[PDB]
């Protein structure tokens, strides 16, 4: 068991 | 139009009309679609004057203009956002959230989101200055559809950034205070609100099993599984990310995911035209197949073994490596009957065909999977059959060629396999 488009960090 | 010196002179005056004139000029100058002079306004010592204007309740125009300008200053580099933060803009925006004017409070939500989106430090700053309480007060109304056009989207985005970033992770009390609102928003009918809520839950699930347990206890897993089947990729991507982060925790959390009915959507996710969807679904499955034997049997009952074999055969090398991991975990902790079903669905041929890969990691993974399948066959007294199958698929040639592999692990594996079954 292992781990590993995203919204903008800032806008306008 | 206006030079930095003219704006400085207008803002340094004592005439409110001229101060507002220069503030609007600065907004337009920093709103330029190209090369905004953010560093020149910062060097001119204007951020403090802007944070001061933010408090002029008598002049809501200049409040709005200063909020806009500071937001567009904090929308750039981390150093410019640092400049805005040092000017005392976070408490001013948190106080402005309660402005009687909706547009100014929305600009304040925007500014606090930009600030908290820079990283965990400014996020925890915004949280410390007491931003969660008013931000969530803006959403207290039982019916979210009564909120103004666009307000909910901005507040959802800002709350997502307040749940984003790690090292440190968001303060636990903040997450427990924001999670119920995130549930309410996950049940909303706006595509973008849903997308940002799923991204927020994804950020919150990316961490230790305690945070996963918080998110699960709130009861988001069923709605996340529902959103897995949405037609909007901006909603499926974060939903699949959250579901995958949840199954990376305990077997009880993975079983919560299974009980919600997630495995029924993976036949589509594993066949999604988008390769990222396929890769994320295959990674989630690899974490699922790494669970208890009953969970492997549930994967079998949902008919996913054929799809996992198909992605191991036909997908790109990324999804194919995820599938190799999934099958290796399937054989590692599965029952002899499940491994026999795997071989019946046709895993030997893809596992062989992927032994000609440059990545040594996938080589070792597939070698371990082969050893596990052979141990199962030995339990079933049918190792000669499996060896004949690997032969017919040209495997023996592959495992022998791997005898000349630089990595000592791959060489030693292949050697043991050949000496024990193909000798």
Author numbering:
A (entry chain C): 119 to 122, 131 to 138
B (entry chain A): 75 to 497
Sentences from the paper on this structure:
In the best characterized pathway, importin (IMP) α bridges cargoes bearing basic, classical nuclear localization signals (cNLSs) to IMPβ1, which mediates transport through the nuclear pore complex. IMPα recognizes three types of cNLSs via two binding sites: the major binding site accommodates monopartite cNLSs, the minor binding site recognizes atypical cNLSs, while bipartite cNLSs simultaneously interact with both major and minor sites. We combined bioinformatic, biochemical, functional, and structural approaches to study this phenomenon, using polyomaviruses (PyVs) large tumor antigens (LTAs) as a model. We addressed this possibility by x‐ray crystallography, and solved the structures of putative bipartite cNLS peptides of MWPyV, STLPyV, WUPyV, KIPyV, and MCPyV LTAs bound to IMPα2ΔIBB.
